[PDB]
């Protein structure tokens, strides 16, 4: 059962991406136990990230481990395609796109072409990331069938929606996304790719290590605990309290996100503090 | 009752912007009684349009005409503050943006935050883009009410909503987007930001000059015969179908739009011209 | 243009109609300008009104006028065919049903057998009740194309919606009853059937006769204020705040609504009142 | 554990309950390991029976079992608490409704008003059938924890939703109702109120003794067997298609659902049993 972390970008104040703050997260996520790393998924700002910005923290990441999941989607084939043809000069784990995003009514057909394009040129395993709370399209099997699909991030709430890939794509890899169902992806999936991973990886480790040990019970305790979580940092914005929660639990600055993913200001950030306390003061009790 | 294009952007086969087409757009669209030209809309691909591209729009329309509003809206603040700085010191109607879009589950605050910005920096009369069904947020009047708001442009199927901004903004001018409403917001807004303006400008101009003219049943017979093209060209993608249309309705041509929007292959461009011939011709018949 | 009101069912304190109440409350609304009744409408509380319940409606109805609509929809298609086969014997209208509803994934063809069941042994025109935010469908033009619909109620928000039954079924009457459309229903349609036709009847007839008239501007500046009311509604429940604006603004009780639909209790009744008064105000001044 | 049976409504030809069949039916569940059977919930066609049709088919299951959770939803409160009283005088598992239906845009306050009133009247163990896609209200924790709640029987495909009832209400049994969730649901709340029970008990009760054996992957191949199964169902109505494979898995005759809840047809029926082989092969072979 695969951990992956979709790794947040730290940027700086001017919002400039902090790639030294990059590479210290990323090692100690490994450290802590996660498998791989989603680089410029939607927890790292991917659709708001430039192309160099991208291909940069590809770069940054790289020093630190080879496994590597590069996502490369924007609004312009052309630049994708950039991108796809200088992640083929790297050894790394695969590369992944969301669907085409924001124009409404798109025929299907598009959506099948633009991945078609990815892996006529890509000499890397394809991933696709399903996410249609964030596209707004949900990428069926029946598209994925004529393509080389290797593995699927999916970010769903509808548990059975990840499993139906599982049947009809024969042995390709699938991965929930959703924080709040890691227990059941753990029990169901291949893995899960759960942005809390930034934060708390020790936690869904330790879910990962008790399930492997038939310790349910315990590993179900802790994501009650998850999801109660969850519920406070919707909030604030879950991706910018996220970067305040790194810092609180991990120890070390990864600096703020970048507007309009607008970062939790001192007050929001002592806020969110005072709320998870009780949460945070249960958790490190059941996870030493 | 103004009539107002969101101007699509001509690509070439490498999908590079072809400025020249255009302005040769442009100008056949004014001379056909377009009131104003709204650059980089969704019609005109904006989210896709890198932020030179974006300028470079506004650029190559500025050697044609005065009557733009400059729509600047991406996923980094900075580029937009930088467009919002480059359209200060040029002489157009006014600057405007859609929310932001794709992330999910952004506090209210976070919209609000991003208009304000916008706001603060721009000399010019700020417009509001407000698309629900592509950026996943819907901008409340209570953001609104806090801002130097001019106009709004709302592209919504649900006419009481566009109708209800000009209860609550005194002053403030509304446009609906539907080309499906078209008649109806002429009727009681201040007027359409409408994308069959860019390959049926004469039709449009003629249901606000019939309805001036108190011909209000001739206006309903244009708008039945424009609900039946929408129609017909969601099969193919509305904004992709445009381009073929505009050179087959208005005899010059404007490229193609750039993948992920994919172009119409030769084969789809025939398929919709056969579609449509009867309905081009009944539209002939009422306007010439 | 045909002003169709959706009458509500009058209720005594133990939930038992009260006919009487019906009776008067219907011959005023006619004598206020009300062309024809929808018996038994969501607003009549259709659903909630038994086999029996519905037959007495339409029988007390018929004493005051012969122009009544009779929705007999429920969820056991029996019951249906005794209420349509009642019906025959009725010089009425026509018959109406809304489509199966609160059962979730019901196949398409479901919907189509269900009307055509009604259409084989009703000797009345047939009307189409559509109002997908209550039954979980929509009723494509495809499906009615095979029935002999003379009519069709469309509650819904888009107005290109019903704008479509009109050009796809020929000589099909459609009447939009959303209360916040009615200008523009008046100036597209064949007429409304909204249910605030109930307690302002000489508004909305006033509006009719303004767009009769060519004065559009006043028939909107109505619409502006039905919109404002139809906002204070919702926060108390639309169809039980009728009731008691009935007594407010006609001057003669029309008893309660039915529990799940809870009256207002006396305070939330004068809360309404003290909410609307401004409204009432400025509607009076404007219509006397 | 449990393994709760949403029990089918047998009806003949005519659309009369023939209570002999589901007497039979009941009989057959219980002998194969089901452990409560909820009377008149969805699959039961609960909102499509009569007062009446409702009472007696609790009338007839009490000759059988003493495991019975009675649904007594329907739109006049007056109906449902007649059935309230009535079911006082028996020896039952608990009292059971959906929230009020059909009507949109109710207040909270009404739902909360409607359980109250159930609450107040019933000597029975107080169950909440929550079915958002159905009624098209969620009811929310908030009502709940003023209410005497002891089970929540929760029909939604976001898993995290029902083991949030869980941590927000101390005590409260918690079963989710999708088919295609139930190896998550028996692996993290008290249970599942499943339709599919009606036709493969011994499928879902094997699921929960592998699982109580720790045999997790021997319990997931047959939730994959089954979702490919609700998938195949889907087409033809689920509940419709309920009827005919209770004759086919279970070998004796259950008759028909009642339009609008329309039959198989001869072809319908043999096109399923095609379709479903090939399942049904590899099902028995995991099961015997
Ligand atoms: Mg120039
Ligand atoms: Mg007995």
């Known amino acids: 059962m695969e951990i992956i972390s979709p790794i947040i970008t730290p ?10 703050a990059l590479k210290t997260h990323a090692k100690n996520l490994l450290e802590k136990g996660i498998d791989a790393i989603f680089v410029n998924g939607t927890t790292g700002l991917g659709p708001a990230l430039s ?13 630190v481990t080879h496994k590597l999941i590069f996502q490369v989607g924007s609004l312009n084939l052309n630049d994708v395609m950039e991108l796809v ?5 790297m050894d790394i784990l695969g590369v992944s796109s969301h669907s085409p995003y924001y124009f409404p009514r798109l025929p299907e057909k598009f959506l099948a072409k633009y991945y078609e394009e ?24 029946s598209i994925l069938k004529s393509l080389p699909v ?29 924080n709040t169902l890691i227990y059941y992806s753990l029990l169901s999936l291949d893995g899960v790719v759960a942005s809390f991973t930034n934060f708390i990886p ?12 038939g310790k349910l019970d315990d590993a179900l305790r802790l994501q009650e605990l998850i999801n109660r979580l969850a519920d406070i940092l919707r909030k604030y914005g879950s991706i910018s309290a996220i970067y305040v929660l790194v810092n609180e639990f991990q120890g070390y600055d990864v600096g703020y996100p970048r507007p309009p993913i607008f970062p939790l200001t001192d007050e929001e950030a002592l806020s969110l503090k005072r709320e998870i306390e009780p949460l945070k003061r249960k958790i490190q009790e059941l996870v030493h």
Chains 1, 2, 3, 4 share one sequence.
């Not at 990815?118 to 099997?141: E, F, K, Q, V």
């Open 118 to 141: 990815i892996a006529r040129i890509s000499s890397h395993s394809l991933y696709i990331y399903n996410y249609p709370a964030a596209t707004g399209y949900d990428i069926p099997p």
């Open 11 to 20: 940027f700086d104040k001017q919002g400039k991406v902090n790639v030294d």
């Open 202 to 213: 020790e936690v869904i480790v330790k879910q990962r290590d008790l399930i492997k040990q």
């Open 51 to 63: 192309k160099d910005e991208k291909r940069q923290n590809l770069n940054a990441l790289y020093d």
């Open 150 to 178: 290797k593995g699927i991030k999916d970010t769903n709430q509808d548990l059975a929606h990840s499993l139906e890939y599982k049947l009809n794509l024969p042995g390709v890899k699938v991965y929930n996304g959703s």
């Open 85 to 89: 043809k200088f992640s083929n000069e």
